[PDB]
Amino acid sequence: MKTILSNQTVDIPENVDISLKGRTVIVKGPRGTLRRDFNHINVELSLLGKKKKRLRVDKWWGNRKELATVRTICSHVQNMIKGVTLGFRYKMRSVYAHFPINVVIQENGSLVEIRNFLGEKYIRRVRMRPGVACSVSQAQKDELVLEGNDIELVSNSAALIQQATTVKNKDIRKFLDGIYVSEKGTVQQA
Amino acid sequence: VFRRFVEVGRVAYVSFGPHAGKLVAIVDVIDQNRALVDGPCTRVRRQAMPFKCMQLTDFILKFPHSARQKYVRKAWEKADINTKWAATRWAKKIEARERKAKMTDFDRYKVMKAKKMRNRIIKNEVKKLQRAALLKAS
Amino acid sequence: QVLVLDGRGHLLGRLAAIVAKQVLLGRKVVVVRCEGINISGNFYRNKLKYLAFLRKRMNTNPSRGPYHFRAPSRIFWRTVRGMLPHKTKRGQAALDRLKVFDGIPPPYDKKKRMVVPAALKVVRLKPTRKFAYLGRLAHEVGWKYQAVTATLEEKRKEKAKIHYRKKKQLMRLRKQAEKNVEKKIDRFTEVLKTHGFLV
Amino acid sequence: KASGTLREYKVVGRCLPTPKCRTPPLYRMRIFAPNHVVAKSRFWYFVSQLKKMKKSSGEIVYCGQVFEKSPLRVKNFGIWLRYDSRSGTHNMYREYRDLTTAGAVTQCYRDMGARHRARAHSIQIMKVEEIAASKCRRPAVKQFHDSKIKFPLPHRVLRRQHKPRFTTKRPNTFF
RNA sequence: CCGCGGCGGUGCGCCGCGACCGGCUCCGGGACGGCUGGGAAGGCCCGGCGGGGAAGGUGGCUCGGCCGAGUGUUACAGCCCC
RNA sequence: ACCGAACGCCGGGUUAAGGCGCCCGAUGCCGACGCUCAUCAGACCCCAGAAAAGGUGUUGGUUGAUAUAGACAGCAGGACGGUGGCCAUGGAAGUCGGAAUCCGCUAAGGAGUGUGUAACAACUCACCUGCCGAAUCAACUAGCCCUGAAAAUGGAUGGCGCU
RNA sequence: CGUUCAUAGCGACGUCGCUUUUUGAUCCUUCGAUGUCGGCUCUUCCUAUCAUUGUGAAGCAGAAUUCACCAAGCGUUGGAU
RNA sequence: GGAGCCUCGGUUGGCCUCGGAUAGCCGGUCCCCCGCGGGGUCCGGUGCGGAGUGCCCUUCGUCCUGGGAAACGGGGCGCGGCCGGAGAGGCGGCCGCCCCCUCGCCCGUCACGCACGCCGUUCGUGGGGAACCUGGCGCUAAACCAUUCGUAGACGACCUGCU
Ligand SMILES: [Mg+2]
Ligand SMILES: [Mg+2]
Ligand SMILES: [Mg+2]
Ligand SMILES: [Mg+2]
């Protein structure tokens, strides 16, 4: 049935500053701004406290599917904060049985060519979601690092290069080839 | 980003229904969409009234969630709600909207004459202010 | 004597209804910025529903067929004509009073243009429901002149900003002028607030 | 039966007396029904399912309205049922929150219409019992057990949609 | 011929009014009966007698300027309720 | 051929059956309470169309459970000995099958859920802890929605449309 | 059944359906006549998908392959009797 | 400027922000950035919307004279220059010069067929279309046929040629 009120907090830390224009959380801090519009979610984003210490997301008269956003908004706001403070670093190892997967970034972290996958003449040029930047790793051999503030943009850009490296017409139980995302992390821990 | 809330003891103007144009202090919320309501001073009986009709004011007098009429009456008369209402812009622009409606066809004419003139004395002053702002710009 | 309704933010068949009935009573109606009009239910849904309508056609000679207009203006005008008696003379006479537009062009760009709230999305849909914009729906179904309509309308809104700004300035002058003048208009303004204005 | 808004009726009745039962036992029933004429019918229907006692065998002694002695209070009714399905019969127990037993009974019927498409003739009310704040099982009702109960009024959709059928102003729903 | 006196029937054409009766369709007033000789309520309060939510209270914590606000616990009546 | 109602010519009033976004007379009520979203929604006697069986889609019920004696999930720790237990040898030491089906140590582990073995081994699946910290889970049932659901000219809740 | 393993692919005993490219039932329509089979030619429609596009499945290592989806865009041939 | 058929509707205008809806509207910036404006923050106001389409504007008898409040406003289809407007512009705005007037608001002061109780009155209106009388300044044809051609062709059509 309808539920007279559900709500939730988010402790923004002192390192970060957050604002909100209406229903459009804006988060800035160390690494830069990160906005996100929540027009489409029908909630009362009460930012409250002196020192602006926490965001609070109401939801009056929610039925089951309505309430379930409440958390998800809050969760998106943590992850905003996280990227502002720490950043996101999605590591992805290359895995191949024979043909080594030659990777080479181009513009900066934007382009990703991926030659000699399965011996294929075709090179997989993969742009990034803008805001992200790939790089190759040193220290660990067959391994990329996708650093970025926006989790979404990072992960998406990861997937992109995960998906580029698929095999057609063969048995993927056997043919375990490609770049795949090994670890989801941050740029600096604290 | 809400401000007026359905509370116990919140005063509500009744937009429409039987008791339209009357204030009423919610005693208690029965249901999702229905409140048990009172208007001791305002000439409204202890009765259930749905929210549909009762648009609600900035006032909230303070008594207990299930009062016994005497006590919400006392609360009302203490806070002088009926005075405070009547000095609100809202209740004034109700009265305004009442007084245009009452207007006799003679009064109507009177008014018409008045505004005819009252607009003229502004429009000239506006003209001047425009002429003087043009001189400043030059 | 003319109804000018801003088609924006209405529900396709909801506004059509009102318009139809008006148009039959002999009110010359102009709807405008139809591409703003938005149809209830989600997009994919409605695109599919337009795509049915394009599937319809006389086999032997398509040329004779149900004339699927693509322009969101026409599309609205088609759905009024579905709520009229258009084979008769009186229905065709009515339909000649309705005037519709893809965006909002020169005779009615400078007109106070109404809204019907009974057709209004923000009133008739629950806020947790999806809805197509007609503009999109036309677009994907074959309408050309989206960008052109848009890019004229930026130029309309810029020009309107200016008009509004200058209105605001006159309103501020009036307010100031009444404050300058008040004492010599006191025994008018008083009477207008004894007979229910100004308050 | 049908509906409108029910009342309560106290019907009482007895198999009318013979040589072999000179002072037969009266029976009483809380009928809930839109009027006394049907109340009495309804009474019989129930009696006959229980006792061997038909209208023609009997009489109704006293049928009369029953008023809520606590109108201006608000109360939580539990209410026990025995409806019918498109399949077989079930029993239930629902809770409503109303100013009058009648109110809550009516408020039940309606719900059953909505939540189960159960028509009136399908339904038997077996008891209606005003209850405390506690003992209430249904958290639908229990979210209204609060002293500092508060809530906004949020997307307050306008009615009077045809007063001004056409107008200048796009409306406003924030209050 | 003037009386348009009294009566009778008429109007060239278009109209309007009035009061009476028939029928409807609504409106506004008032006066009454019954009931669980209605149920609740209101108003004056007094004497007792208990029970519960939960309080001018206290307490752990939080948020603001000893005071105000928000949660929490045992719970008398100095908020009420039964 | 249903439902209403049965016919001289008309004025006023009222109805039935059915209706009242617009086509189309009437809801242009501030009508009431729910339910429901369909990338095939649904939308009214006769009637012109679907079933069994499914669905953590949602909304109600019913009955059991659980549980501060410290849970529920989530990760972490162990999962044994009498014992190749008996029958079956083709090999079944828990593990093609089948009759059995108890005790010890127990904190606790079945003569054993699976995976895998020619057969083992190895792996896997209770009872309890640590972080954790108040409620949580199962089986039924029925309402709307969905899956089940394929035909030929383009097409028909009468149409437009309606959330 | 499928070394094993109910459900990769199958599916008995049972059961529920859809379809009108089979045949029956039927006899409403036409007997003051709707030209009675094939093939030829031509168009279009359907999908219940053989092929091709993009895909999930396997008892898919590759090759070949079945099983299923979106899908009727484009094709689907020459001859002996 | 004069008549004179016909076609009819009408019977104050509204000269414009964008948009939002779990929000908006307006101010003013003390202060900061951008091109008198735009953006920002901060503060102050409204917000069942009064800087409200529940609204705004406009008045609806005519004239006289003889006081007040208000007062340089209005006109002569007054006349010349400078603008803005292209989405289907079709409308404004702003600047010189000539002549005339005393309009709105209150009052005094009379008079205007007062047509004798009674209907299509009251306007957009010099309306749309057709035929007729005046001045001023401008104008000076193509098309079809026939003839020809063959880029064409059933016939028409088409494509070309001819002081
Ligand atoms: Mg087997
Ligand atoms: Mg034939
Ligand atoms: Mg298919
Ligand atoms: Mg293969």
Coordinates of C-alpha atoms in Angstrom, one line a residue, chain A residues 51-185:
Chain A
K51 CA 28.7 22.8 7.8
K52 CA 26.1 21.3 5.3
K53 CA 26.9 17.9 6.8
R54 CA 24.2 15.7 5.2
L55 CA 21.8 15.1 2.3
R56 CA 18.4 13.7 3.2
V57 CA 16.0 12.2 0.7
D58 CA 12.3 12.1 1.7
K59 CA 9.5 10.2 -0.1
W60 CA 6.0 10.8 1.1
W61 CA 3.1 8.4 0.3
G62 CA 5.3 5.9 -1.7
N63 CA 4.1 2.7 -3.0
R64 CA 6.6 -0.1 -3.3
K65 CA 8.2 0.8 -6.6
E66 CA 8.2 4.5 -5.6
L67 CA 10.0 4.0 -2.3
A68 CA 12.7 1.9 -3.9
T69 CA 14.2 5.0 -5.7
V70 CA 14.8 6.7 -2.4
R71 CA 17.8 4.5 -1.6
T72 CA 19.0 4.4 -5.2
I73 CA 19.2 8.3 -5.3
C74 CA 21.1 8.2 -2.1
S75 CA 23.4 5.6 -3.5
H76 CA 24.1 7.6 -6.6
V77 CA 25.0 10.5 -4.4
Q78 CA 27.6 8.6 -2.4
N79 CA 29.2 7.5 -5.7
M80 CA 29.2 11.1 -6.8
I81 CA 31.0 12.0 -3.6
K82 CA 33.4 9.1 -3.9
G83 CA 34.6 10.2 -7.4
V84 CA 35.0 13.8 -6.3
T85 CA 37.1 12.7 -3.3
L86 CA 38.8 9.5 -4.5
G87 CA 38.0 8.7 -8.1
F88 CA 37.3 5.4 -9.9
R89 CA 39.9 3.1 -11.3
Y90 CA 38.5 0.1 -13.2
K91 CA 41.3 -2.3 -13.9
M92 CA 41.0 -4.8 -16.7
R93 CA 43.4 -7.6 -17.5
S94 CA 43.7 -9.0 -21.0
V95 CA 43.3 -12.7 -21.2
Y96 CA 44.4 -14.8 -24.2
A97 CA 45.4 -18.3 -24.9
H98 CA 47.5 -17.6 -28.0
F99 CA 47.2 -14.2 -29.7
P100 CA 48.4 -11.6 -27.4
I101 CA 46.0 -8.6 -27.2
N102 CA 48.0 -5.6 -28.3
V103 CA 46.5 -2.4 -26.8
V104 CA 47.6 1.2 -27.5
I105 CA 45.8 4.3 -26.3
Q106 CA 46.0 7.2 -28.7
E107 CA 44.7 10.7 -28.0
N108 CA 45.1 10.5 -24.3
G109 CA 42.7 8.1 -22.6
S110 CA 40.1 8.6 -25.3
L111 CA 40.9 6.1 -28.1
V112 CA 41.8 2.4 -27.6
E113 CA 43.1 0.4 -30.5
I114 CA 43.1 -3.4 -29.9
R115 CA 45.1 -5.2 -32.5
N116 CA 45.8 -8.9 -32.9
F117 CA 42.8 -10.2 -31.0
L118 CA 42.4 -13.8 -32.1
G119 CA 44.8 -13.0 -35.0
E120 CA 42.2 -10.7 -36.5
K121 CA 43.4 -8.2 -39.0
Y122 CA 40.6 -5.9 -37.7
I123 CA 41.6 -3.4 -35.1
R124 CA 39.0 -2.3 -32.6
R125 CA 39.1 1.4 -32.2
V126 CA 37.2 2.3 -29.0
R127 CA 36.6 5.8 -27.9
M128 CA 35.8 6.5 -24.2
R129 CA 32.8 8.1 -22.6
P130 CA 34.1 11.7 -22.2
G131 CA 35.3 12.4 -18.7
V132 CA 37.2 9.1 -18.5
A133 CA 40.7 8.4 -19.5
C134 CA 42.2 5.0 -20.1
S135 CA 45.8 4.2 -19.8
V136 CA 48.1 1.2 -20.0
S137 CA 49.6 -0.1 -16.9
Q138 CA 53.2 -0.5 -15.8
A139 CA 54.1 -3.1 -13.1
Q140 CA 51.3 -5.5 -14.1
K141 CA 51.7 -6.8 -17.6
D142 CA 48.4 -7.4 -19.5
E143 CA 46.3 -4.8 -17.8
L144 CA 44.5 -1.5 -18.4
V145 CA 43.4 1.2 -15.9
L146 CA 40.3 3.3 -16.5
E147 CA 40.5 6.2 -14.1
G148 CA 37.7 8.6 -13.8
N149 CA 35.4 10.5 -11.5
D150 CA 32.0 9.5 -12.9
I151 CA 31.5 5.8 -12.0
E152 CA 28.9 5.5 -14.7
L153 CA 31.2 6.9 -17.4
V154 CA 34.1 4.8 -16.3
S155 CA 32.3 1.5 -16.0
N156 CA 30.5 2.1 -19.3
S157 CA 33.8 2.8 -21.0
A158 CA 35.2 -0.3 -19.4
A159 CA 32.4 -2.4 -20.7
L160 CA 32.8 -0.9 -24.1
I161 CA 36.3 -2.4 -24.3
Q162 CA 35.1 -5.6 -22.6
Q163 CA 32.5 -6.0 -25.2
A164 CA 34.6 -5.1 -28.2
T165 CA 36.7 -8.2 -27.5
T166 CA 34.2 -10.9 -28.1
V167 CA 34.4 -14.0 -30.3
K168 CA 31.9 -14.8 -33.0
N169 CA 30.8 -18.2 -34.1
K170 CA 33.0 -20.1 -31.5
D171 CA 32.5 -21.7 -28.2
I172 CA 33.1 -19.2 -25.5
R173 CA 33.5 -21.8 -22.8
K174 CA 36.7 -22.7 -24.6
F175 CA 37.7 -19.4 -26.4
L176 CA 38.3 -17.3 -23.2
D177 CA 39.8 -14.3 -24.9
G178 CA 39.7 -10.6 -24.4
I179 CA 39.9 -7.7 -22.0
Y180 CA 37.7 -8.2 -18.9
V181 CA 37.2 -6.1 -15.8
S182 CA 39.3 -7.5 -13.0
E183 CA 38.8 -4.9 -10.3
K184 CA 36.7 -1.9 -9.4
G185 CA 38.7 0.6 -7.3

